[PDB]
Amino acid sequence: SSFERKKLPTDFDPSLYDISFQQIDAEQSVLNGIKDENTSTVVRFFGVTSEGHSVLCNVTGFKNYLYVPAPNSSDANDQEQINKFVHYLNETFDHAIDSIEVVSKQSIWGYSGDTKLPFWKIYVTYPHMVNKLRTAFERGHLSFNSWFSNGTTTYDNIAYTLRLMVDCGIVGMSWITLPKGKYSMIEPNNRVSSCQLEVSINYRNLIAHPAEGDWSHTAPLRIMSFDIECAGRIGVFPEPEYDPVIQIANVVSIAGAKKPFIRNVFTLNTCSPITGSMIFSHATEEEMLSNWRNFIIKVDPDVIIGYNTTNFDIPYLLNRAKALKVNDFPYFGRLKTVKQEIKESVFSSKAYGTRETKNVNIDGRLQLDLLQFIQREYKLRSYTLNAVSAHFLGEQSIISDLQNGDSETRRRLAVYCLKDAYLPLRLMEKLMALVNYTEMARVTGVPFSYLLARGQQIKVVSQLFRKCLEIDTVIPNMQSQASDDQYEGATVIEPIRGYYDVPIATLDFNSLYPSIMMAHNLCYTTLCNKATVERLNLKIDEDYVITPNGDYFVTTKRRRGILPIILDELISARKRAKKDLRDEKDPFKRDVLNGRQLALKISANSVYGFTGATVGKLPCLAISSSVTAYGRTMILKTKTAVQEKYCIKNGYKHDAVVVYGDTDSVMVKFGTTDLKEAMDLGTEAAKYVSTLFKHPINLEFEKAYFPYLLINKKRYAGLFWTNPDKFDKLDQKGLASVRRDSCSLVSIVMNKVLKKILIERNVDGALAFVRETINDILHNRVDISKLIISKTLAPNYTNPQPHAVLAERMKRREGVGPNVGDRVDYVIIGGNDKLYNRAEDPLFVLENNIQVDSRYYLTNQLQNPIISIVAPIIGDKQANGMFVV
DNA sequence: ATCCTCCCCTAC
DNA sequence: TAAGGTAGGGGAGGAT
Ligand SMILES: Nc1ccn([C@H]2C[C@H](O)[C@@H](COP(=O)(O)OP(=O)(O)OP(=O)(O)O)O2)c(=O)n1
Ligand SMILES: [Ca+2]
Ligand SMILES: [Ca+2]
Ligand SMILES: [Ca+2]
Ligand SMILES: [Ca+2]
Ligand SMILES: [Ca+2]
Numbered sequence A: 001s002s003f004e005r006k007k008l009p010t011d012f013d014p015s016l017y018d019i020s021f022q023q024i025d026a027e028q029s030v031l032n033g034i035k036d037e038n039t040s041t042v043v044r045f046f047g048v049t050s051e052g053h054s055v056l057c058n059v060t061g062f063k064n065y066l067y068v069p070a071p072n073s074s075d076a077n078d079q080e081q082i083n084k085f086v087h088y089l090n091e092t093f094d095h096a097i098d099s100i101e102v103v104s105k106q107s108i109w110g111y112s113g114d115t116k117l118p119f120w121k122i123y124v125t126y127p128h129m130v131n132k133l134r135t136a137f138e139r140g141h142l143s144f145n146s147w148f149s150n151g152t153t154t155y156d157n158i159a160y161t162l163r164l165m166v167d168c169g170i171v172g173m174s175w176i177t178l179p180k181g182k183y184s185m186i187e188p189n190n191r192v193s194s195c196q197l198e199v200s201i202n203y204r205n206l207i208a209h210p211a212e213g214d215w216s217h218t219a220p221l222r223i224m225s226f227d228i229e230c231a232g233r234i235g236v237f238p239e240p241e242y243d244p245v246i247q248i249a250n251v252v253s254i255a256g257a258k259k260p261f262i263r264n265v266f267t268l269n270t271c272s273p274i275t276g277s278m279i280f281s282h283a284t285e286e287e288m289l290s291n292w293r294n295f296i297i298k299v300d301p302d303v304i305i306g307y308n309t310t311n312f313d314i315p316y317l318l319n320r321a322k323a324l325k326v327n328d329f330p331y332f333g334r335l336k337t338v339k340q341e342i343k344e345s346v347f348s349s350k351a352y353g354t355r356e357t358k359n360v361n362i363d364g365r366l367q368l369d370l371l372q373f374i375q376r377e378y379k380l381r382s383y384t385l386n387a388v389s390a391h392f393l394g395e396q397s398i399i400s401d402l403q404n405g406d407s408e409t410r411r412r413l414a415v416y417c418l419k420d421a422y423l424p425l426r427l428m429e430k431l432m433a434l435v436n437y438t439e440m441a442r443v444t445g446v447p448f449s450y451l452l453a454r455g456q457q458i459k460v461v462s463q464l465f466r467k468c469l470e471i472d473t474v475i476p477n478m479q480s481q482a483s484d485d486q487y488e489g490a491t492v493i494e495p496i497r498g499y500y501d502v503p504i505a506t507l508d509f510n511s512l513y514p515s516i517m518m519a520h521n522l523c524y525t526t527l528c529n530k531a532t533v534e535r536l537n538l539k540i541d542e543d544y545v546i547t548p549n550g551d552y553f554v555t556t557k558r559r560r561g562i563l564p565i566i567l568d569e570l571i572s573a574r575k576r577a578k579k580d581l582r583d584e585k586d587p588f589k590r591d592v593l594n595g596r597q598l599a600l601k602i603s604a605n606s607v608y609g610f611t612g613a614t615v616g617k618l619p620c621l622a623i624s625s626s627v628t629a630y631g632r633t634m635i636l637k638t639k640t641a642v643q644e645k646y647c648i649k650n651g652y653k654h655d656a657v658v659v660y661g662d663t664d665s666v667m668v669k670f671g672t673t674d675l676k677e678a679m680d681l682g683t684e685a686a687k688y689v690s691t692l693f694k695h696p697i698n699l700e701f702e703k704a705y706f707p708y709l710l711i712n713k714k715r716y717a718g719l720f721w722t723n724p725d726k727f728d729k730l731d732q733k734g735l736a737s738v739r740r741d742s743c744s745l746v747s748i749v750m751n752k753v754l755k756k757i758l759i760e761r762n763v764d765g766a767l768a769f770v771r772e773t774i775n776d777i778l779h780n781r782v783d784i785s786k787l788i789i790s791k792t793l794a795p796n797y798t799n800p801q802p803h804a805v806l807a808e809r810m811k812r813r814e815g816v817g818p819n820v821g822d823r824v825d826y827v828i829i830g831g832n833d834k835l836y837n838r839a840e841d842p843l844f845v846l847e848n849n850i851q852v853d854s855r856y857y858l859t860n861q862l863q864n865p866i867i868s869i870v871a872p873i874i875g876d877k878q879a880n881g882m883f884v885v
Numbered sequence B: 001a002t003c004c005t006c007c008c009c010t011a012c
Numbered sequence C: 001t002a003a004g005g006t007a008g009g010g011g012a013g014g015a016t
Helices: A079-090 A129-139 A160-168 A285-299 A309-323 A370-377 A385-393 A399-403 A407-430 A433-444 A456-470 A512-519 A530-535 A562-582 A587-611 A621-645 A675-690 A744-759 A763-778 A802-814 A842-847 A854-874 A876-881
Strands: A019-030 A041-049 A054-060 A065-069 A097-107 A117-124 A175-178 A183-185 A197-202 A207-209 A222-230 A245-254 A262-268 A278-282 A303-306 A345-349 A353-357 A366-369 A498-500 A504-509 A544-546 A552-554 A657-660 A665-669 A699-712 A715-721 A729-733 A789-792 A823-828
Touching: A019 A054, A019 A160, A041 A160, A065 A129, A079 A097, A117 A129, A160 A456, A222 A285, A222 A309, A222 A399, A222 A407, A245 A285, A245 A309, A245 A407, A262 A285, A262 A407, A278 A285, A285 A309, A303 A309, A303 A407, A309 A366, A309 A370, A366 A370, A366 A433, A370 A407, A370 A433, A385 A407, A399 A407, A407 A433, A433 A456, A433 A562, A433 A587, A456 A562, A456 A587, A498 A854, A504 A512, A504 A621, A504 A675, A512 A562, A512 A587, A512 A621, A530 A552, A562 A587, A587 A621, A621 A657, A621 A665, A621 A675, A665 A675, A665 A699, A675 A699, A699 A744, A699 A854, A715 A744, A729 A744, A744 A763, A744 A854, A763 A854, A802 A823, A823 A842, A854 A876
Parallel strands: A054 A197, A222 A303, A262 A278, A303 A366
Antiparallel strands: A019 A041, A019 A175, A041 A054, A065 A117, A097 A117, A175 A207, A183 A197, A222 A245, A245 A262, A345 A353, A498 A699, A504 A665, A504 A699, A544 A552, A657 A665, A699 A715, A715 A729, A789 A823
16 A cells, blocks of 8 residues: 555644654754754654654754863963864864863773862864864874873763763653754755654753653554565576566554554566555566655655565665666655665674674664564574574465466465565564564663664663763773783583482572672772772772772772663663563463563673673773672682582581582582472572672572483583473583584484483483484485584684585585575585585585485484483493494 | 694583 | 673694
């Protein structure tokens, strides 16, 4: 269809109507016409009112700025001289320095006392000039009055849009009210957007509502999900230069609605009717594309979603329209003449990997590619639409041929395309993608768009700037300087390896690293030193503390740190999510709620990580190292306290043994053969141990393993009990059977062997199954699908890896192949070459009847993991004999 | 025969 | 702030 937004009130007028809208995105821009507070640059916020009206609100009069410390010079307070310095800067920086305001601030770096210092807040008429100013102060030669020649630390480096959001109290996905009489309409001939309401307000006059109570609701966002089909060549993934887009299916709904209010398919050529959806068929591809752009503009979606839309559908359409010279195509943002462009960049982090990105500006609309969401929030063996639809939704080549048939074959194609457009919307709603990300944007204060495009650091940065503003504190700008060394981390306890046929109680600290930062008041602002404690005559333990890393931090007596408060808020949110999880029946919903609480846990742990990131801009290893140091002492103290308490000479039946533990957990063999008693002792022990640490540190009994197969550090399995009557699952940590680089032959067999032993207590049956499997490998009875190994392609290599060698080979053969950051699928083929030269594309293998290295799969894939699980039961000799041959 | 490094992924 | 942290198994090969 294409229904448009509800019409505005007929008597609408800025003097009559407040405008309250949920802002979903914002960007820096220059406003045509009069300046405000000597600047023509604005932050344009886009969003939606409770009645479903779209809004572009220009926030005017907000000048970017930087802080530098006032010079240590007698003439520093002479206004005439400050005025002259401003003239000097205007001569140097394109006449873009507005003024200098003298303010009292303190650096976030350390405790020197509560005495604040004079800083110079230097305002600019356009935001980007702050960067050049910062550079000049840092490495330029601003030699006026010998004030900064030369040179100086600068403070509060942050992008202009976020600077405004922080200073105005605006978080992501938040509500803003524009009071009647306080804003003005953009005149018809000056309009730049297609929003129903295009207005301007001075930043001081907007009301930024905290996302709480009556202002924690969300606006009725219009969600558009789409999917395209292309008719491409046999053997070639479609290329925009040659292969037509032949269908675009669309579904549009209101956030949270039961059903979409628009369902349609744009087709090239004719297409027979589809019950419950509109069909818009076109004689030419060009027409279809232009109509689709017009459709977006008229429907005015707030969020554009789909599955792989980011890396495929969107760039493909842009590139296709360009190839076809449909030159007005790429204008479907909310800014009428702002072109959608592909920005090529690179994203890299340990958590998310390293890869090229192709982000497109669709100004004033959000994007939520469900493939990108699911990849971030879930660990799955496969992320194909089919795979994830079957997994989350319970769902169960010819394309070009269907296209070249008739109205009926194209209809068939259109149902497929419509379904592919609908699934992402089902996924978004069931996985609560929009709802949970709204929460995250609000809690951390970042724009929604940062969640999928950016990392954990920017969320920490936003929270830090917001807390610092509250206490007149500013943050020094430092250059990233990656270290060649990692600081010392956690203790992993030496395992007493083997098969335990008695209950093992697992105890672990709630939110360990955050609880350590809170208990011990660990923050940039509380960091001190020997020199200060003496100049100030502070008393150990009352006024400060010395960490096991040897660092001095002041106590809450002297200063409440800010990191503890940020962590407190994140843990509160997490606790709300956990309660929701505790209160929910449906297994699937609980799953989703489990990701929500995990996401918030990672956010809290990322505040610790931020302090340890030298690949980052505010490392403080005093904090990160003190945290890990405390952690090592705590697990040692926990192990010692459990062993000293629960022993025969204290009236217990057995001497408790800590058989294993990792970072913040201990696995305890109390000695009893009874499961409930082990769980009761585990609970009592955690309660006792918790009394030995400072609030809010807390040890809890987590679960019992019975039996428990401990193979090595970070390698074990066990039946996992949270009640003594029925076990929850067969839990596996670290084993090949839970690593996504195992071939499924190994994972499946390991899984079945573990089940037969731990659940069915049938070692004989497990061994018969392994022997059968060995026979199948050696007689080529294993489907190639179970032999495929997948590994991520790294950006660069020192040592040649089989999948990386194969990726280059594939490009040589086909002109294209896996890119950095893609998983590469391969099987090992037979032959005399080095292993890294013997990884091959499974399709290439099938096509050419190439023999797979069967013995390799036996000896170098199956054999070691299987021996490691059965040897503890049948012994090393038998386990090894089973593999001859 | 030991111990190291690069690599990939997972345990925290 | 472009990009949260460290420990460590085990495959595969390198240096003494
Ligand atoms: N992604 C992660 C996971 C863990 N850790 C560190 C900090 C954690 O506090 C500690 C223990 O890991 P847990 O998985 O037990 O995490 P928590 O104790 O924080 O959370 P929970 O309350 O779920 O046990 O390891 C981390 O820095 N980053
Ligand atoms: Ca698709
Ligand atoms: Ca726990
Ligand atoms: Ca924990
Ligand atoms: Ca743990
Ligand atoms: Ca090692």
